Amino acid sequence: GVQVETISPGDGRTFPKRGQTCVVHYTGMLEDGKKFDSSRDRNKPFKFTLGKQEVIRGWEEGVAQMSVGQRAKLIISSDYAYGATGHPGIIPPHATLVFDVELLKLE
Amino acid sequence: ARPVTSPGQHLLAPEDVVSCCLDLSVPSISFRINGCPVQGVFESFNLDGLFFPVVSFSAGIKVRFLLGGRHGEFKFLPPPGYAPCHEAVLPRERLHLQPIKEYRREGPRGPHLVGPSRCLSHLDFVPCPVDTIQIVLPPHLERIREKLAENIHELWALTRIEQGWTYGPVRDDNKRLHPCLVNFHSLPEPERNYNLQMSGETLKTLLALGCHVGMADEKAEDNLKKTKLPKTYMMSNGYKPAPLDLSHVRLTPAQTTLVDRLAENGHNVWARDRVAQGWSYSAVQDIPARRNPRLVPYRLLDEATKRSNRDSLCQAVRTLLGYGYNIEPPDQEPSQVDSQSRGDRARIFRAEKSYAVQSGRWYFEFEAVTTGEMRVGWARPELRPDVELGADDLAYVFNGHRGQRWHLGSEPFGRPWQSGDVVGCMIDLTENTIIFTLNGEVLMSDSGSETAFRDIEIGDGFLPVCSLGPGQVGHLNLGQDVSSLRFFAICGLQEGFEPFAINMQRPVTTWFSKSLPQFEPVPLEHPHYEVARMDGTVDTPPCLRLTHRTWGSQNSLVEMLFLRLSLPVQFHQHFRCTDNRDDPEIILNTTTYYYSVRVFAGQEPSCVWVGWVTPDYHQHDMSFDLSKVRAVTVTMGDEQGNVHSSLKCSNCYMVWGGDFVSPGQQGRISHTDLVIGCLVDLATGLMTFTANGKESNTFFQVEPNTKLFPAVFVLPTHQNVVQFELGKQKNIMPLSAAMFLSERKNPAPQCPPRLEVQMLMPVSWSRMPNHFLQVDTRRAGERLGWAVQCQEPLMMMALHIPEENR
Amino acid sequence: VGEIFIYWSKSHNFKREEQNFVVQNEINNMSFLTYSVQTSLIVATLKKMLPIGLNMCAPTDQDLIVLAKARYALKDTDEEVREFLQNNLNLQGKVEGSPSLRWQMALYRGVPGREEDADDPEKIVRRVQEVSAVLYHLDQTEHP
Amino acid sequence: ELLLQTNLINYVTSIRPNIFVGRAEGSTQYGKWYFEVMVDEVAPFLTA
Ligand SMILES: Nc1ncnc2c1ncn2[C@@H]1O[C@H](COP(=O)(O)OP(=O)(O)OP(=O)(O)O)[C@@H](O)[C@H]1O
């Protein structure tokens, strides 16, 4: 894998730690640029606990490197994403994912 | 979007200062963020137009343009040689912020519809004086040359002293000092020579423009008396101007027009000379920098300067007339301009097709904010967007610029309108009539009939419609608020007509004729162009052949034609790192695809361009050539230069058929067809071409995921124009294998029904949004600049066609 | 003007003498406005003045106008119509009934004075009777 | 790639000063120009 490219800076100090619940806002696109998911469309931040294998590996590592209040683009390869199986009907097999993730808070 | 490296990279945030520099000599565009260089540049882009600063935004922004001077103090010093943008404001304009190509605006009583804007061209800043070098002065004009040279300076010095200029050592405007305010024979050599040459040039342009002038008096020549100027008009050095007094010389209207032309020519000659010397325009004068506020072509000059120049030239003409010469203005030679196509120029606004009325008595109003070319009336739902309103039978309209009724042509009717006049349009579908009123009074035809049109067939119904020419403004009131109508009560209410939108809970949706060329399938009934789908034979692949139906006959339409295929080929997401019977392994493992274009004998190859276009191509250029293709290079490098990448971006990748015409064959109509093949490697981004089996030198490189449509631009010169051949070559797949997933591994050429020929149409109907972004622009101050603000969000549900990326 | 037009419509010597006068004197009715019963100045002036007459009647009085036109078609006299309206004023239109009446009456009330008047049955019957007679005879004139 | 795609998008508009510069042979216009834009307020996600 996952490459993190900053879009807007965070505080630069507070980074997620294992067991903390990251509350984020994200928009997901395929490599060719087709949007397939967005928490802003549902108008509700997405919460996930680090280290519980709740999200894909790319998300785990990228949000781990991210800092509180930071906006960043995560480029996640197939192996760190749904891989060969993909997500039937949503994500094609062997698809690289691009996410625009904002780390709203830690709790 | 191409990432560019800068210190502290971040999306534009509050307190950010973006500095943009444009160097038209390279050409290049460079950026700086908070004073730090942005490691990336645009360059080698088209220069056929005028560039302007621009900011694009969605709702939720507040920014300020800093243009230097009193229009926003720069936070960082401009790079050496670059000029503040505020200096580019034209003499007859006042700096302010405006939208770009708006078809709609707000106004005191509601939305105003706006026609096309008249835009300047980069060639409008090139002074083009009339050529006067070969005009040898006849003896009389040659004699008067010197007298004019002195008298012009006399008049100019008189004006100078009257306005304040007094003699001094240097050009000190602060102390009102002029060093050249002396006797002409003692004037400094350079200025004296320039004055002499200009004085001769006046007679020379007089002759060149077409005037017939010669001696007709000598007694008057010796009779002209000079004005005695007093000590007040005396110079500081004692110089006294000597403008000859000729109060007996009258003038004529054609002579005033010729005076205007002479002033224009003189100013343009001066501007050309200064440009040659190296001067340029600037809203603020800078003599050391050779920047002048008047160094612009006469047409763009300020009114006061025009008046001064015209006064001087009129005085010169008067002096010649007093001398007695017979200055005879040339005859007027009519000419046409038609800057663009009239059928596609005026913007047409109509009600949505679902509002068509098939019965009843309906009324609406149209206020003409301007008084130029505007038409208003009723249209059928199937109104075309590229036809002038009322040129065909699909609209009954009234044009109030001169007073005419338009339906299948023009006829005199009514009277011309003035600014603010309201045209009331009524349609009675019980009597099958249409009525027009102006400020409440029914407009009448020459015969005296009170109905503009009669015996109207209802058909599919009628819709309110209007057309605004360039620079025109109208206000369409469909009567949703009956109280807003200004003349309904005076005429129509008692007659029983009903406002068009009287009982609608929402404003009536409107559509406008958008002038953005778009590719649409060739109509099956097109009067000029026919496309034939030819099946593949044993020795021929599938083909799509274009033929000109009306070639070589009266009414034949011969113009540039832009054709593409309906489906694109898409390059792979990732590029590879670094007999005549196909070999199965090669043909099933290849990523190269091929398609040919046959130009039939009699179709000039010099009038054909073959290649590809991207989804973004929208140029309906009637004088197309490969030099008009949009192109730009994006160059990214390090903080210390050292270019990393230089990507070329364009929307048209084509070869010119003229590149494959042998010099021996040049100038002669060949009897052999020219076959141009195009190869694209979808795994490497490389595009190559062949001509009659011979490889050409033209090659292109595109980025991954690029979409390319096969395309052909041609100016027909024969009944058989071109033929898309969707064949293959040895070990190279056909276009169907790239276009269709199910055929990805099928080497047999195919042309399924979806694949068809589309042509570029200049105009198309487009729905106007019901709501528009509220943007506020204002001058924040002399130091803050010009503030743009947009706070209220506005969204739409967009329907996206994947293959067209639209 | 409506009374004069009504006399013209009723009497038959009136129309004939108008035709003879226009034919003989070669009067240019088209020039006057700026031979044909359409160009007859008697009906043209009434048509030009008709909007003023209609402006007196409120939108609600349209049904009463229709009933009065029906009577005048039945060849009732002016007093007969004036009594018909006097005794079936209750057949006056109601705004709630039609949406068109809503905005028509909105404009009518917006016009000053028009809302102040029209509260008198005598005024209502007089207006409806006069306008209905004029409209009836206009219908007869336009019909061949 | 086959079915039509839908989505909610923001309206975007452009604003310019009436400043027009260009290059042409014999033109009276200067070739190098410079301007700045200062950003005061930006709501990154006013909408979705
Ligand atoms: N704005 C202008 N429009 C037209 N012609 C001009 C203009 N400026 C200069 N010229 C030409 O150059 C000449 C310059 O002015 P003139 O010869 O009267 O005096 P000068 O002392 O040389 O000029 P200046 O007014 O700059 O001191 C004008 O006579 C005219 O021939």
Side-chain angles (χ1 to χ4, degrees), chain A, chain B residues 1-145 147-188 190-218 220-230 232-806, chain C, chain D:
Chain A
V2 51
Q3 315 156 48
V4 188
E5 271 128 32
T6 182
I7 296 163
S8 284
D11 70 358
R13 298 137 29 211
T14 327
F15 291 77
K17 284 301 136 33
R18 266 188 82 282
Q20 260 171 323
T21 298
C22 318
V23 190
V24 303
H25 252 324
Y26 72 93
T27 297
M29 310 126 266
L30 307 169
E31 207 181 4
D32 44 65
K34 302 186 183 123
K35 187 189 97 183
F36 66 86
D37 197 9
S38 175
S39 45
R40 319 200 167 252
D41 282 334
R42 295 173 295 258
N43 210 1
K44 184 158 82 93
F46 173 69
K47 307 182 172 205
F48 76 97
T49 304
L50 255 189
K52 281 214 172 343
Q53 317 289 284
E54 301 180 329
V55 296
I56 49 171
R57 186 137 99 100
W59 259 63
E60 288 259 9
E61 311 199 350
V63 182
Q65 321 184 11
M66 279 197 54
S67 147
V68 168
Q70 168 166 14
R71 195 174 151 197
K73 181 214 272 164
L74 315 183
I75 312 176
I76 300 155
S77 45
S78 277
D79 44 319
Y80 280 47
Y82 296 108
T85 88
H87 218 317
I90 307 123
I91 292 148
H94 293 299
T96 284
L97 303 186
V98 178
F99 287 95
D100 176 344
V101 184
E102 191 200 338
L103 180 48
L104 304 168
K105 71 158 82 103
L106 287 167
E107 70 182 35
Chain B
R2 285 173 185 86
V4 64
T5 290
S6 104
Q9 266 156 273
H10 62 286
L11 211 69
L12 290 178
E15 301 323 279
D16 273 3
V17 184
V18 187
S19 307
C20 326
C21 344
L22 164 73
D23 179 1
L24 287 159
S25 83
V26 175
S28 92
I29 289 162
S30 17
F31 295 93
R32 257 186 324 157
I33 181 65
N34 297 310
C36 318
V38 176
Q39 288 146 57
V41 293
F42 302 101
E43 48 186 22
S44 316
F45 41 85
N46 302 70
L47 296 160
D48 49 6
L50 292 167
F51 296 82
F52 54 87
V54 59
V55 66
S56 52
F57 52 91
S58 80
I61 66 106
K62 168 64 188 322
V63 301
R64 270 175 309 108
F65 272 102
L66 310 167
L67 308 160
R70 312 193 343 300
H71 299 281
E73 169 161 21
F74 292 137
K75 316 284 291 187
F76 301 96
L77 260 206
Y82 287 73
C85 263
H86 84 271
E87 306 177 346
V89 64
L90 292 191
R92 43 173 47 240
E93 307 287 332
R94 179 209 110 241
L95 208 163
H96 69 272
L97 302 186
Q98 58 185 201
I100 301 116
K101 264 56 182 322
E102 45 171 359
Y103 54 77
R104 174 249 188 233
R105 263 194 323 252
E106 305 280 3
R109 305 170 14 83
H112 281 188
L113 304 175
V114 186
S117 62
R118 322 161 163 295
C119 312
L120 281 183
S121 129
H122 61 304
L123 306 167
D124 290 345
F125 294 87
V126 180
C128 290
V130 90
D131 162 358
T132 75
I133 46 76
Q134 67 315 322
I135 312 281
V136 284
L137 299 315
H140 37 84
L141 313 187
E142 187 44 65
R143 195 194 103 271
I144 312 251
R145 186 219 69 58
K147 261 186 333 187
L148 229 56
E150 294 95 42
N151 191 38
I152 299 153
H153 182 299
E154 297 320 280
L155 291 142
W156 161 80
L158 186 154
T159 309
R160 286 330 220 190
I161 181 50
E162 178 52 307
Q163 79 199 67
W165 279 113
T166 184
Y167 180 82
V170 284
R171 195 74 44 105
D172 201 311
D173 43 65
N174 318 299
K175 175 48 214 58
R176 198 68 296 185
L177 294 181
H178 213 271
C180 272
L181 277 193
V182 309
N183 153 281
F184 187 83
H185 310 135
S186 69
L187 185 73
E191 279 68 40
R192 166 129 56 112
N193 307 328
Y194 193 82
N195 288 24
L196 287 146
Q197 82 82 4
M198 284 312 237
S199 84
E201 263 271 31
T202 83
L203 305 313
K204 280 179 50 171
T205 169
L206 250 174
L207 261 42
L209 283 199
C211 300
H212 320 80
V213 52
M215 203 91 42
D217 207 312
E218 289 83 8
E221 196 272 334
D222 52 275
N223 286 342
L224 300 181
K225 51 278 205 184
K226 58 145 289 312
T227 54
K228 177 59 199 36
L229 298 203
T232 89
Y233 280 178
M234 186 134 268
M235 266 303 81
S236 98
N237 73 287
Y239 161 57
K240 77 85 210 193
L244 33 80
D245 163 42
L246 55 153
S247 322
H248 43 87
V249 176
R250 315 303 76 185
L251 242 272
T252 111
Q255 250 174 23
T256 88
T257 281
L258 170 96
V259 158
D260 177 80
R261 305 270 309 298
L262 284 207
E264 171 170 357
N265 188 80
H267 176 81
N268 286 358
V269 158
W270 168 84
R272 194 210 44 221
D273 295 347
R274 284 318 193 65
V275 170
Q277 288 164 227
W279 288 66
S280 51
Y281 172 73
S282 175
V284 315
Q285 189 173 28
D286 198 357
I287 297 208
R290 277 128 57 219
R291 319 275 315 271
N292 195 266
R294 292 144 23 224
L295 193 36
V296 86
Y298 186 78
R299 207 177 29 81
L300 309 173
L301 220 55
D302 187 30
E303 263 318 295
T305 309
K306 280 202 234 213
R307 256 195 327 261
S308 92
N309 302 12
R310 266 187 308 233
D311 289 354
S312 162
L313 256 292
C314 214
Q315 290 335 309
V317 145
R318 282 207 197 286
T319 68
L320 299 210
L321 269 204
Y323 281 130
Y325 288 58
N326 40 47
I327 291 100
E328 268 75 80
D331 88 320
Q332 173 50 241
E333 303 75 340
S335 162
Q336 256 302 306
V337 303
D338 43 274
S339 178
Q340 310 88 359
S341 154
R342 299 310 71 192
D344 317 339
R345 195 63 195 151
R347 207 137 42 198
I348 306 162
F349 308 81
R350 64 158 169 76
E352 193 163 71
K353 290 192 210 174
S354 78
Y355 293 96
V357 284
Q358 265 166 317
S359 86
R361 295 197 290 286
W362 301 105
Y363 171 98
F364 77 86
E365 270 178 15
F366 174 86
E367 186 202 325
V369 188
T370 57
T371 83
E373 186 63 36
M374 287 173 295
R375 313 192 182 172
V376 63
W378 304 90
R380 303 199 180 274
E382 293 310 302
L383 180 73
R384 292 194 52 113
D386 41 17
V387 181
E388 265 162 56
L389 261 196
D392 59 2
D393 65 317
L394 290 181
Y396 308 70
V397 299
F398 165 69
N399 177 9
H401 187 205
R402 270 161 272 81
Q404 316 178 301
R405 60 162 163 229
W406 281 82
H407 178 253
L408 274 169
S410 162
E411 289 174 355
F413 176 87
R415 52 207 208 255
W417 50 34
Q418 265 85 67
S419 178
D421 273 7
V422 181
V423 180
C425 314
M426 281 169 272
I427 188 151
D428 187 332
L429 293 153
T430 85
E431 314 280 352
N432 299 61
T433 48
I434 282 164
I435 297 110
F436 292 114
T437 77
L438 190 60
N439 291 347
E441 312 160 68
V442 172
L443 296 162
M444 291 161 2
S445 77
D446 305 354
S447 110
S449 175
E450 298 233 292
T451 52
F453 305 95
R454 60 176 66 65
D455 305 313
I456 295 144
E457 182 242 332
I458 300 191
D460 259 359
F462 286 96
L463 296 157
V465 73
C466 68
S467 200
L468 278 70
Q472 298 313 307
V473 181
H475 172 42
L476 203 65
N477 191 350
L478 296 191
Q480 215 214 340
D481 172 27
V482 71
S483 91
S484 66
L485 298 172
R486 295 165 62 186
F487 297 102
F488 181 55
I490 292 147
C491 195
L493 173 61
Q494 314 294 352
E495 289 77 2
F497 286 84
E498 212 148 23
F500 184 79
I502 180 54
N503 284 310
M504 314 256 186
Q505 54 206 347
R506 279 166 325 265
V508 166
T509 292
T510 39
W511 294 57
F512 77 107
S513 51
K514 193 151 97 163
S515 257
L516 177 72
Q518 298 268 20
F519 277 107
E520 285 154 44
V522 175
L524 253 165
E525 69 283 344
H526 199 281
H528 303 288
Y529 305 129
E530 176 194 334
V531 172
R533 318 186 49 103
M534 323 288 294
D535 309 337
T537 83
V538 55
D539 56 323
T540 277
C543 284
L544 300 161
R545 174 206 301 259
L546 183 86
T547 51
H548 197 320
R549 319 170 104 117
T550 58
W551 180 255
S553 103
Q554 223 75 0
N555 70 338
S556 201
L557 170 83
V558 189
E559 56 175 12
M560 272 294 312
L561 187 57
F562 302 81
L563 305 165
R564 81 158 191 214
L565 292 198
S566 49
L567 278 349
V569 306
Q570 180 137 36
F571 285 77
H572 292 175
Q573 175 67 74
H574 303 291
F575 283 171
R576 280 197 300 249
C577 48
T578 78
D579 174 272
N580 214 74
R581 284 178 325 280
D582 303 318
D583 314 354
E585 75 289 9
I586 304 193
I587 194 68
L588 286 322
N589 283 274
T590 187
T591 49
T592 309
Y593 303 87
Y594 171 88
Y595 98 91
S596 37
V597 173
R598 172 176 307 272
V599 192
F600 298 109
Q603 174 54 50
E604 294 317 296
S606 322
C607 296
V608 190
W609 295 261
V610 174
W612 312 79
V613 292
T614 69
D616 165 48
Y617 186 90
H618 297 298
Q619 315 178 226
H620 197 53
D621 199 349
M622 288 299 101
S623 58
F624 176 85
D625 83 80
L626 278 185
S627 94
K628 319 279 207 78
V629 170
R630 293 311 101 172
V632 58
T633 305
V634 195
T635 305
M636 309 275 184
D638 297 310
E639 52 271 351
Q640 62 255 354
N642 312 346
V643 167
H644 291 182
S645 40
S646 213
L647 292 162
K648 286 181 60 34
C649 330
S650 183
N651 62 349
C652 184
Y653 305 92
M654 293 184 158
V655 290
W656 180 43
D659 300 328
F660 314 121
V661 185
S662 212
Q665 190 58 246
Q666 265 163 37
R668 178 170 53 273
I669 301 115
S670 167
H671 320 116
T672 65
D673 297 353
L674 167 62
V675 180
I676 297 154
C678 317
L679 293 96
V680 279
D681 193 324
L682 297 190
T684 74
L686 182 67
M687 327 171 36
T688 52
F689 303 83
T690 57
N692 284 333
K694 184 183 137 202
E695 185 194 10
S696 87
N697 324 301
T698 308
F699 86 93
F700 293 108
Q701 176 71 41
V702 299
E703 285 174 70
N705 264 349
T706 293
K707 275 205 252 265
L708 285 183
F709 297 80
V712 169
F713 303 163
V714 57
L715 173 71
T717 87
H718 199 241
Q719 59 268 21
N720 309 291
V721 197
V722 284
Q723 185 180 65
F724 280 96
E725 323 192 283
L726 315 166
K728 63 182 309 296
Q729 305 257 99
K730 213 209 152 84
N731 298 320
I732 293 144
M733 283 292 235
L735 268 194
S736 63
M739 275 169 178
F740 309 101
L741 165 89
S742 61
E743 312 304 312
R744 182 70 18 102
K745 289 301 142 169
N746 181 28
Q750 294 178 337
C751 182
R754 205 176 165 200
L755 196 49
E756 79 197 327
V757 179
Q758 308 175 325
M759 48 178 305
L760 198 63
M761 304 296 201
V763 192
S764 288
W765 286 114
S766 209
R767 184 192 188 273
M768 308 189 358
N770 297 113
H771 301 282
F772 293 91
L773 274 183
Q774 302 299 298
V775 182
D776 166 72
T777 59
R778 42 169 308 264
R779 182 168 180 171
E782 295 221 333
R783 188 178 45 62
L784 287 185
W786 288 81
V788 194
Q789 193 168 37
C790 192
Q791 300 307 121
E792 289 315 304
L794 210 67
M795 305 196 73
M796 72 167 227
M797 172 151 30
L799 183 102
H800 174 89
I801 302 121
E803 65 261 33
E804 291 184 317
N805 201 23
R806 207 177 25 110
Chain C
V1 172
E3 257 171 309
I4 289 161
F5 162 73
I6 283 155
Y7 290 140
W8 181 83
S9 64
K10 293 178 156 353
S11 154
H12 173 252
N13 294 276
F14 210 152
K15 315 199 184 61
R16 221 201 299 91
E17 293 300 37
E18 199 222 311
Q19 285 300 143
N20 316 352
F21 177 91
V22 86
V23 153
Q24 268 80 321
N25 285 247
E26 291 300 61
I27 298 306
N28 194 11
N29 270 343
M30 264 294 203
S31 72
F32 280 7
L33 298 155
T34 315
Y35 330 133
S36 99
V37 298
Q38 296 81 238
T39 49
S40 146
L41 249 194
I42 311 287
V43 70
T45 309
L46 187 270
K47 281 215 265 236
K48 295 246 197 214
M49 281 291 308
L50 186 51
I52 285 92
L54 299 164
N55 196 77
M56 335 162 60
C57 308
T60 46
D61 311 329
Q62 233 293 351
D63 325 307
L64 304 165
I65 285 159
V66 197
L67 310 170
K69 283 174 49 59
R71 297 313 296 175
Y72 279 113
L74 302 174
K75 320 300 253 214
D76 269 46
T77 201
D78 280 31
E79 256 306 355
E80 279 165 66
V81 177
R82 216 172 289 100
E83 283 331 283
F84 182 15
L85 309 201
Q86 187 65 262
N87 65 34
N88 309 24
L89 273 204
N90 45 56
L91 298 214
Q92 196 169 6
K94 273 294 144 275
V95 310
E96 69 86 60
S98 166
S100 156
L101 254 60
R102 186 217 343 281
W103 69 264
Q104 264 152 9
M105 209 84 176
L107 265 168
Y108 176 91
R109 277 186 317 300
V111 184
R114 289 221 281 181
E115 82 306 327
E116 169 59 52
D117 208 37
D119 308 331
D120 183 301
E122 302 83 299
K123 295 200 180 359
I124 297 154
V125 302
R126 193 145 325 271
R127 291 147 40 202
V128 178
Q129 186 259 296
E130 294 150 355
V131 178
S132 49
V134 162
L135 290 167
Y136 175 33
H137 286 94
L138 243 178
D139 296 350
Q140 313 298 271
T141 305
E142 56 90 11
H143 124 80
Chain D
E1 269 285 326
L2 268 178
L3 304 174
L4 303 166
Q5 309 299 310
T6 48
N7 195 35
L8 295 179
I9 79 184
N10 281 318
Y11 276 103
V12 168
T13 195
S14 299
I15 291 284
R16 64 155 179 230
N18 51 337
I19 282 150
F20 305 96
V21 301
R23 180 158 65 107
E25 182 64 51
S27 175
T28 70
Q29 274 186 315
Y30 196 62
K32 286 194 231 321
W33 296 99
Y34 174 86
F35 78 94
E36 280 174 7
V37 165
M38 189 149 191
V39 186
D40 295 334
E41 297 147 32
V42 170
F45 279 98
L46 183 69
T47 70

